[PDB]
Design a protein around this ligand. Structure first.
Ligand SMILES: O=C1NC[C@H](CO)[C@@H](O)[C@@H]1O
Length: 410
C-alpha cells in the first residue's frame, strides 16, 4: 500500500510527516502463534491498549535460534540451520494482520548480538560444534562479545544469515496472502539487535569488517526488497566500540535509510540503581550528551534518528510490579522534553521506542526468572521479569507516554 519513506531527516507516510512513538515488544510475534506458545487473545488486548496510549510502532524480533541455555527464549524459530518452525512464523503473519487493523507499523530485526534469542553466538556454536556458554553464568562478557563478532568473519555464518533473511523477506502472509515485500505494515527490516564490532579490545581490522558487514547486509536486503526501509539496530557510539567514526562509516551507505541509537544509563554504569539520588545528576548530563552527539551525526549524514531503545530500572532496582517508578518516569520526561524540542527545531529526531512493554504479562516466579511456558514480557529471558518493562498498571508511566505520544504527532 503506502510505505513509510524517508525524506531528509524525517519519515513520511502518504506525503505527511511520520514520527515514531513506539515500544519494544520483542515477543509480539511469538504471542501471535496459533499453538500453545501463543496467546492471541492477549495480543489483541495489548495492541488495543497500546493504540489507546498513542503507540504507532513496535520493534519486534523476527527470528530466534534454538539454544539450551537458561537465558534464551524457548521454543525457537530456527531448530538448526534451515529448519524453521512454520507454526511459529504464522505468529508473525498474525501480528502483521493485527497491526494492519490498527494502523500500526513494525520494525523487525533478524538476529541478535546477545544470547537471549540465540543470535550470533548460536550460529557460531552450530558451526563449531561447541555449545554456547551463557555469559549470565560465566560473566565472561569480553570473550562473549568477541565470539559474537566472529560471526561477521564466517562465510558459512553469512550464507546462513542471508538464507534466513531471504526466507522471511520472501514470505507470503499465510492469513491475508500479502507478500511481505508488499506489506506497508512493515516499516523497516533491521539487520540485528545491537550489532557491535567486538569487545573492548577490537582491532582496526575488526572495525572495518563490521563496517563492511553493515554495508553488505543492507545491500543484500535491498536486492530482495527495493522499497522497505533498512536499519542496522546499532546502539550508536556505545555499540561502535566508543568510536563515533565507526558508527558514521558503517551507516554512510545509501542502503541504510535511517539511524538508530539506544541509551542504557544503568547498564553503562552512569546510573547506580541502588544510589539513584547520588548518581542521577551525572547520569542525566551524560545522557543529554549522548543524545546531542547522535543528533549531530544524523545532521551530518542527513538521515532520521530513532531512539529505538531506552529504559530505566524501577525505584531501588525492584522487580516487583507494586514498586514505584519515580526515577524512570522523570527520565522519560527529560528524554521526551529534549527530543520534542529537537523535533520542533527541525533536527532529525524522528521518534523513539521505549524498552520495554510488559502490559498484561505477569510472573509469579520468586526469583523473577522466566521459564518455558511463562508469560512473555518486554524483559527477555536473560533479565529479570520486571527489570525494565512497563506494566499496564504503571499508571504514572503510561500517562507520560500518552501525553508525549500525542505531542510528537504532527
Ligand atoms: O537490546 C537490548 N539492550 C539492552 C536491554 C536492557 O538491558 C536488553 O534486554 C536487550 O538485549
Amino acid at each position: 500500500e503506502h510505505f513509510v519513506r524517508v525524506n531528509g531527516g524525517h519519515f513520511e507516510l502518504q506525503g505527511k510527516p511520520y514520527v515514531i512513538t513506539g515500544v519494544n515488544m520483542w515477543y509480539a510475534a511469538y504471542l501471535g502463534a496459533p499453538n500453545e506458545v501463543g496467546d492471541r487473545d492477549r495480543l489483541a488486548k495489548e495492541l488495543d491498549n497500546l493504540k489507546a496510549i498513542g503507540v504507532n510502532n513496535l520493534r519486534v524480533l523476527a527470528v530466534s535460534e534454538k539454544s539450551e541455555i537458561n537465558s534464551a527464549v524457548k521454543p525457537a524459530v530456527t531448530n538448526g540451520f534451515g529448519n524453521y518452525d512454520e507454526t511459529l512464523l504464522q505468529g508473525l503473519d498474525y501480528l502483521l494482520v493485527e497491526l494492519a487493523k490498527r494502523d500500526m507499523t513494525v520494525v523487525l530485526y533478524f538476529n541478535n548480538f546477545w544470547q537471549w534469542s540465540g543470535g550470533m553466538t548460536q550460529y557460531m556454536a552450530w558451526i563449531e560444534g561447541e555449545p554456547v556458554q551463557d555469559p549470565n553464568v560465566t560473566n565472561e562478557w569480553e570473550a562473549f562479545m568477541a565470539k559474537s563478532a566472529s560471526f561477521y568473519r564466517s562465510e558459512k555464518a553469512q550464507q546462513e544469515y542471508r538464507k534466513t533473511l531471504e526466507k522471511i523477506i520472501t514470505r507470503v502472509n499465510s492469513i491475508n496472502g500479502k507478500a511481505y515485500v508488499d506489506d506497508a505494515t512493515i516499516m523497516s527490516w533491521q539487520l540485528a539487535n545491537e550489532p557491535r564490532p567486538g569487545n573492548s579490545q577490537t582491532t582496526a581490522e575488526e572495525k572495518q569488517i563490521y563496517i563492511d558487514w553493515v554495508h553488505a547486509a543492507a545491500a543484500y536486503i535491498k536486492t530482495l526488497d527495493a522499497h522497505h526501509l533498512v536499519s542496522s539496530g546499532s546502539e550508536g557510539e556505545m555499540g561502535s566500540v566508543n568510536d563515533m567514526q565507526v558508527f558514521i562509516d558503517a551507516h554512510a551507505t545509501p542502503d541504510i535509510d535511517y539511524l538508530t541509537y539506544h541509551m542504557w544509563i544503568r547498564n553503562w554504569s552512569w546510573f547506580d540503581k541502588t544510589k539513584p539520588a547520588e548518581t542521577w545528576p551525572s547520569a542525566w548530563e551524560k545522557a543529554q550528551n549522548y543524545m546531542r552527539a547522535h543528533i549531530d551525526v544524523a545532521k551530518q549524514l542527513n538521515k532520521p534518528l530513532v531512539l529505538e531503545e531506552f529504559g530505566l530500572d524501577r525505584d531501588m532496582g525492584s522487580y516487583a510490579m507494586d514498586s514505584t517508578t519515580e526515577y524512570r518516569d522523570n527520565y522519560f520526561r527529560g528524554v521526551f522534553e529534549l527530543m520534542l524540542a529537537s523535533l520542533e527545531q527541525g533536527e532529525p529526531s524522528a521518534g523513539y521506542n521505549i524498552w520495554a512493554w510488559n502490559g498484561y504479562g505477569r510472573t509469579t516466579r520468586a526469583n523473577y526468572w522466566w521459564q518455558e511456558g511463562d508469560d512473555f514480557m518486554g524483559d527477555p529471558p536473560q533479565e529479570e521479569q520486571g527489570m525494565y518493562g512497563v506494566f499496564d498498571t504503571d499508571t504514572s508511566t503510561i500517562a507520560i507516554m500518552k501525553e508525549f505520544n500525542a505531542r510528537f504527532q504532527p
